[PDB]
């Protein structure tokens, strides 16, 4: 049993959902059909060190479903604040509930991730494949336990989506489900604007830095060194005073705009030159283990797969999505790639990408369907 405890958080109405959708075109074109009941859950999963840890997330259940209810597991993007995660259901979370739950009618399952929400680990293991995958799978299983306890019948339809860091989480979750849980059917998978490829992503974020690049890299290397100690210490990685500022900024209680204002726009300024150059040149002594963590685009998909993003992305390289697409196509014809724009950026494109995800899942909902 993974489910440890839960708390009812009240309802999320059609009317509240409609207001949220209207704020984020093109999602305003979705029709709302349901009110949802919300639960915050806590569940058992493994830490980066392979110990038991109790993590949190949100489950949202359409009330009075007209059809049999499929599950969508939605993996959120980068969060620097402990409490800005789905189990808190703040207004920024509403669009996910509105689109997937109130409109699409899916039981919507949203992990917080380790180091966030109620989890006692002090720091999120950021873009770390092993635990993003296991924490998301264990959340799904715990959510299914909740539905069983509440006599909420669900179908066997299962959809996996996410954005940004969560696009990566979605891909690694998919891989691990296929490997470790081969008898659990997955219906469709649609990672949104994910980072693909260690070299591709490092080059883009370090040398073509968009507005959040320094923050992403600070989070990534601070978290990786914290959990894995691949380098001698933080001062090998980070130039002063960022070696001590970054740990403060990443405490879970700094607003993301404050983090972005405290860090330079050019990520090279936060690193020792030796270190950053070694990463870029793949001459860092840890390059092989870094590639193992990052590179998850060479496995056989066991469900229809849509890689959806924006060619306008300045946060993660669209070239990485193109590379991943060709890699996955070696294994399956049921693989597609879609750009929602030539110029919308990572943030602007988000509601367009969400709309594509919902539409993709609906395509696979309405075939191969049996009670």
Q: Which is closer to Cl ion, CB of 68 or CB of 327?
A: 327
Q: Which is closer to Cl ion, CB of 57 or CB of 320?
A: 320
Shortest distance (Å) from residue 291 CB to Cl ion:
5
Shortest distance (Å) from residue 323 CB to Cl ion:
10
Task: Kindly tell me the number of DSSP H helices and DSSP E strands found in the chain.
Answer: 13, 9
CA-closest candidate to residue 62, choices 40, 87, 86, 37: 37
CA separation for the pair 312, 9 (Å, rounded): 38
User: Phi/psi zone of residue 153: left (φ > 0), alpha (ψ -120 to 50 degrees), beta?
Assistant: beta
The residue numbers preceding gaps of C to N over 2.5 A in the chain are none
Shortest distance (Å) from residue 197 CB to Cl ion:
5
User: Phi/psi zone of residue 366: left (φ > 0), alpha (ψ -120 to 50 degrees), beta?
Assistant: alpha
Q: Which is closer to Cl ion, CB of 198 or CB of 242?
A: 198
Phi, psi (deg, nearest 5) at residue 248: -65, -50
Q: How far does the chain reach from its first CA to its final CA, in angstroms? A: 26
CA-closest candidate to residue 284, choices 275, 292, 293: 275
- The footprint of Cl ion (CB under 5 A) covers 198-199, 291
Q: Which is closer to Cl ion, CB of 191 or CB of 195?
A: 195
Shortest distance (Å) from residue 218 CB to Cl ion:
21
Shortest distance (Å) from residue 198 CB to Cl ion:
4
Shortest distance (Å) from residue 333 CB to Cl ion:
26
Shortest distance (Å) from residue 177 CB to Cl ion:
24
Q: Which is closer to Cl ion, CB of 113 or CB of 198?
A: 198
Q: Which is closer to Cl ion, CB of 125 or CB of 195?
A: 195
Shortest distance (Å) from residue 282 CB to Cl ion:
7
Q: Which is closer to Cl ion, CB of 19 or CB of 289?
A: 289
Q: Read off the tokens for 147.
A: 């539905």
At 177 the three-state DSSP class reads helix
308 near 353, Cβ under 8 Å?
yes
CA-closest candidate to residue 61, choices 52, 49, 69: 69
Neighbours of 366 (CB within 10 A): 8
Q: Which is closer to Cl ion, CB of 186 or CB of 279?
A: 279
If you ran DSSP here, which 8-state letter would residue 238 be given?
A: B
Q: Read off the tokens for 172.
A: 């690694």
At 207 the three-state DSSP class reads helix
């Amino acid at each position: 049993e993974k489910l440890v405890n839960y708390i009812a958080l009240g309802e999320f109405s059609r009317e509240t959902a409609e207001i949220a959708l209207k704020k984020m075109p093109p999602l305003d074109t979705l029709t709302v059909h349901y009110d949802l009941q919300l639960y915050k859950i806590n569940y058992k999963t493994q830490s980066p060190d392979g110990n038991l840890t109790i993590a949190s997330g949100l489950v949202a259940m359409p009330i009075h479903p007209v059809g049999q209810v499929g599950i969508i597991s939605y993996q959120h993007g980068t969060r620097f604040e402990r409490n800005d995660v789905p189990s808190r259901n703040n207004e920024k979370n509403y669009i996910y509930l509105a689109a997937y739950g109130n409109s699409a009618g899916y039981m919507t399952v949203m992990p917080d991730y380790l180091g966030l929400g109620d989890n006692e680990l002090t720091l999120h293991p950021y873009v770390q494949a092993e635990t993003l995958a296991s924490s998301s799978i264990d959340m799904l299983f715990a959510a299914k336990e909740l539905a069983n306890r509440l006599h909420y019948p669900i179908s066997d339809k299962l959809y996996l989506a996410g954005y940004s860091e969560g696009g990566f989480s979605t891909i690694v979750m998919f891989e691990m489900l296929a490997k470790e849980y081969p008898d659990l059917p997955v219906s469709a998978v649609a990672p949104g604007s994910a980072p693909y490829g260690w070299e591709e992503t490092m080059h883009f974020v370090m040398l073509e830095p968009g507005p959040r690049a320094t923050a992403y890299l600070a989070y990534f290397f601070y978290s990786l060194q914290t959990y894995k100690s691949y380098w001698s210490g933080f001062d090998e990685i980070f130039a002063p005073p960022y070696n001590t500022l970054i740990p403060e900024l990443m405490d879970g209680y700094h607003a993301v705009d404050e983090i972005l204002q405290a860090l330079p726009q050019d990520p090279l300024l936060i690193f020792q030159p030796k270190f950053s150059n070694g990463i870029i040149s793949k001459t860092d002594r840890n390059t092989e283990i870094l590639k193992i963590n990052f590179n998850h685009y060479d496995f056989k998909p066991t469900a229809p797969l849509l890689l959806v993003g924006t060619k306008g992305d300045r946060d993660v390289p669209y070239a990485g999505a193109e590379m991943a697409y060709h890699s996955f196509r070696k294994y399956s014809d049921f693989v597609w790639i879609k750009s929602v724009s030539d110029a919308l950026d990572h943030v602007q494109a988000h509601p367009f990408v969400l709309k594509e995800q919902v539409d993709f899942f609906k395509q696979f909902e309405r075939q191969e369907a049996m009670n």
